[PDB]
Design a protein around this ligand. Structure first.
Ligand SMILES: Nc1ncnc2c1ncn2[C@@H]1O[C@H](COP(=O)(O)OP(=O)(O)O)[C@@H](O)[C@H]1O
Ligand SMILES: [Mg+2]
Length: 371
């Protein structure tokens, strides 16, 4: 009743993910579109509210589609959407976040076959009391008793079982998501976590790598066409965003990718088309400034914690963007001798950790199997 399942939720800037403990193993639950992560995006059409993939498909084209709401959590800023009758609805960050949490809860209940009323939700380590409390409030609005707020790098460490280490460990977490870059140095001793230092940039993420591909496509276009004003064509812009992210993702697995955009826009001489082969080497050249900006935050946490690099016992790669080969190579170069951990899907690892934390809070060793 009050002692039922405690689901784990990663409420991310770009994507969200829900996991639950099942027979002593964390399981990641698929949304109704069959996907293990859900875009953190919400569309409003009066009281019809759409969350996730369907909303992402209109993020450029629909003025009542809300993105990056996490950035406002803990402030008294509002976002505005327009009702059918022309009046304006003001929404708090808590209210919009709550729609994402409600979507996850609803599909999780149908998968599990039970009502759910308890959760652990993750936040960035730098969140203050107001930012944490905003996240608790979003949970409450969605019908979830938020049993604990835990830090994202700590959740990742729980997923890997590092709290069960026999010796004291220093752990470097390099977390490159869609919008933000977080480096954390954790001390794990006696099954408890201490954040020794944090660094990074909350305006650097995978979106920036996409945007460099968009900038490149715009250059290719400019070799044949001037005076397009491409930004005013919202369909063109939505297609460019989708094509860039797709191309980037393919280049994590392959050495080349083809960007194909027939009838992208029109000029007085007919259609503008794109057919462009992008190699991994060219992609890496274009995005080198972005990659290099991730380097100094690693040495920042080493400096602040007053450790030598050899004192780092384990490295965790978190965030979808760490699937990029050049990102993995950079991290290896900064902690010589150590093989980074990426065996747990880096887009799911935070939610998995939250689900483990939920199991522990609920109790019952048959249920969490924490040894
Ligand atoms: N295979 C891949 N290669 C490169 N980038 C990827 C890959 N898979 C996901 N990404 C990127 O990861 C970013 C999202 O990170 P994620 O950790 O899932 O969310 P959040 O930023 O909300 O924590 C996006 O920029 C996405 O394109
Ligand atoms: Mg994240």
């Amino acid at each position: 009743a009050d002692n039922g399942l405690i689901i784990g939720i990663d409420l991310g800037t770009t994507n969200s993910c829900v996991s639950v403990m099942e027979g002593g193993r964390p399981v990641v639950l698929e949304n109704p579109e069959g996907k293990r992560t859900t875009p953190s995006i919400v569309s409003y059409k009066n009281n019809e509210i759409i969350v996730g993939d369907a909303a992402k498909r209109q993020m450029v084209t629909n003025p009542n589609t809300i993105v990056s709401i996490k950035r406002l959590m803990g402030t008294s800023n509002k976002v505005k959407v327009q009702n059918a009758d022309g009046t304006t609805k003001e929404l708090s960050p808590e209210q919009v976040s709550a729609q994402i949490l409600s979507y996850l809860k609803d599909f999780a209940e149908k998968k599990i076959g039970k009502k759910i009323s308890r959760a652990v939700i993750t936040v960035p380590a730098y969140f203050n009391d107001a930012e944490r409390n905003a996240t608790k409030t979003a949970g409450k609005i969605a019908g979830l008793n938020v049993e604990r707020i835990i830090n994202e790098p700590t959740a990742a460490a729980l997923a890997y079982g590092i709290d069960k280490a026999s010796r004291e460990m220093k752990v470097l977490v390099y977390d490159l998501g869609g919008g933000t870059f977080d480096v954390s140095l954790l001390d794990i001793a006696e099954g408890t976590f201490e954040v020794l230092a944090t660094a990074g940039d909350n305006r650097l993420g995978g979106d920036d790598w996409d945007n460099k591909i968009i900038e490149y496509i715009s250059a290719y276009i400019a070799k044949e066409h001037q005076g397009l004003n491409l930004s005013k064509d919202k369909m063109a812009m939505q297609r460019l965003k989708e094509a860039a992210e797709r191309a980037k993702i393919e280049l994590s697995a392959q050495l080349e990718t083809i960007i194909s955009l027939p009838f992208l826009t029109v000029t007085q001489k007919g259609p503008v088309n794109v057919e462009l082969k992008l190699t991994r080497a060219k992609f890496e050249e274009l995005t080198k400034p972005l990659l290099e900006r991730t380097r100094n935050p690693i040495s920042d946490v080493i400096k602040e914690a007053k450790i030598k690099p050899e004192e780092i016992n384990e490295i965790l790669l978190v965030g979808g963007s760490t699937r990029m080969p050049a990102v993995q190579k950079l991290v290896e170069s900064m902690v010589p001798g150590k093989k980074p951990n990426r065996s747990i899907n880096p887009d799911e690892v935070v939610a998995i950790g939250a689900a483990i934390q939920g199991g522990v809070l609920r109790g019952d060793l048959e249920h969490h199997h924490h040894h």
